[PDB]
Amino acid sequence: PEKKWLGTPIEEMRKMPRCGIHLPSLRPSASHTVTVRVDLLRAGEVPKPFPTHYKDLWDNKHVKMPCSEQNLYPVTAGSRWELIQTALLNKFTRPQNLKDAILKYNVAYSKKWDFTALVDFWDKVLEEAEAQHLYQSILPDMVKIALCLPNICTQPIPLLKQKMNHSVTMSQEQIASLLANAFFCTFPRRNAKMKSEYSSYPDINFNRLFEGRSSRKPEKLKTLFCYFRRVTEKKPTGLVTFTRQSLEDFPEWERCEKPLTRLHVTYEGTIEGNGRGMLQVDFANRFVGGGVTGAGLVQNEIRFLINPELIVSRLFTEVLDHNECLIITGTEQYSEYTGTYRWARSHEDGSEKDDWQRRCTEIVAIDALHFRRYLDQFVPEKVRRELNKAYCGFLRPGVPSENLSAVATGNWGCGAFGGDARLKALIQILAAAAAERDVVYFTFGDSELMRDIYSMHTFLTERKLDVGKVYKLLLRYYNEECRNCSTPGPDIKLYPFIYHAVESS
């Protein structure tokens, strides 16, 4: 029988907080927006906002806040924020009450936004007492934090545009207020099909969670209301950092002399459960979070539900270009799940916090390409694209490699997305090697794949092939077995080809 895991013992892999650099003082800079009072930051205390009082920017470089005095609506032109306040400061006893409240400041979508799934959740899925608690406690508490937005998020939030290398660090409390607003669909300029300014950003308002008959919707709502119940009953005290990273220069893959690093590979366990303290790869959509606020539940998006603070990145994160990723440090897990997705129960996150009061949970969104024609991914241009995407996700400029955790990852962009698991494993191993990080690879039930990955890594390591030598083998595979292949896949597979090439010298 196959073993459960192979390679380096997982406990010998580096992880946070132990491996981490000494953090300098948290402070704003040209590359770092910090929305809280750093001098008053104290463990277990809700951070205070900086500035003390709301300051507004309504322009193309910052989030358009719903509480802006430039957020106008027909009443003459009147305050949409005052209308939002009046709409939401009402008693809800039936789901149509919530629908009508939300539509008061979204009149243009009165017909276009269906609320069938919300109605069904409220009346059919919840028991009478659960529904009562929803509308007597949770929803009014959600309204309170949402309408406190100008007192909570006092500092303009910059848009993380393409090509920006920039960080935003905000409190979990600030994020809660932002997400309560997203639930009540209050963010202006984020709704229209013909959107101009925000066409290159993901949806943020939660309207599409309320629509349709999908049996998935009630499980999404359960998971989000678990979060909203938690943060309203006990205000979170941590910080979260969102960093856009955009690299212009990449390794010279054909000549790279860096050695392969360590590997732990296993067909049991999960990235979030067993990669604690490690850099956790989110198998992302280029629109980060993908369809999380609307339809379907695909590769990675479950993470955005169980760590819902990740969702707020959609407010300010432009669609990722090929050379870009988003790194999120400090999100908390609020829910556990089974499966077929179903909310199981709440989660009490036990992670330690770093010196900036950020939970030791680092997630990187990197989007694989889709391969609608299988052989496309072996073309050198496409191998390099994926290498560079992974490398951007793994690299930490100016951080010594000894202070970097192992990368916790798995079958990135494979299955129905068209990626070949064995190629993608080797691509991630090479990118990790170039960024000088070890790899913890979860195959999620596939024990033969675990063995095949371990066997290849062992062979390449023992024969002392560096990144460049392995890349050259991938080029040979393309040129000799793929370029002229007239069938969907070649007769000789990649790993067998690599073994024979090296063994024949």
Numbering used by the authors: 442 to 516, 524 to 787, 791 to 956
Q: What did the publication describing this PDB structure actually write?
A:
Reversal of PARylation is predominantly carried out by poly(ADP-ribose) glycohydrolase (PARG) in nucleus and cytosol, whereas ADP-ribosylhydrolase 3 (ARH3) may play a role in mitochondrial PAR degradation. PARG comprises an N-terminal regulatory/targeting domain and a C-terminal catalytic domain. The mouse PARG catalytic domain has a bean-shaped structure, with the active site in a deep cleft in the middle on the abdominal side.
To understand what caused the activity difference between the mPARG E748N/Q and E749N/Q mutants, we solved the crystal structures of these mPARG mutants. Interestingly, while E748N and E749N mutants were completely dead, both E748Q and E749Q mutants still retained residual PARG activities. In wild-type PARG structure, Cβ and Cγ of both E748 and E749 residues are semi-buried. Mutation to Asn, which has both Cγ and Nγ linked to Cβ causes a spatial collision. Therefore, the conformation changes in this catalytic loop completely abolish activity of mPARG E748N and E749N mutants. To study the enzymatic mechanism of mPARG, we tried to soak the catalytic residue Glu748, Glu749 mutants E748N, E748Q, E749N and E749Q with the iso-ADPr, which may be the smallest PARG substrate containing the α(1→2) ribose-ribose glycosidic bond to be cleaved by PARG. For E748N and E749N mutants, this may result from the conformational change in the active site associated with the mutation. Our work revealed precisely how some of the PARG mutations (e.g. E748N, E749N) disrupt the PARG activity through significant conformational changes in the PARG active site.
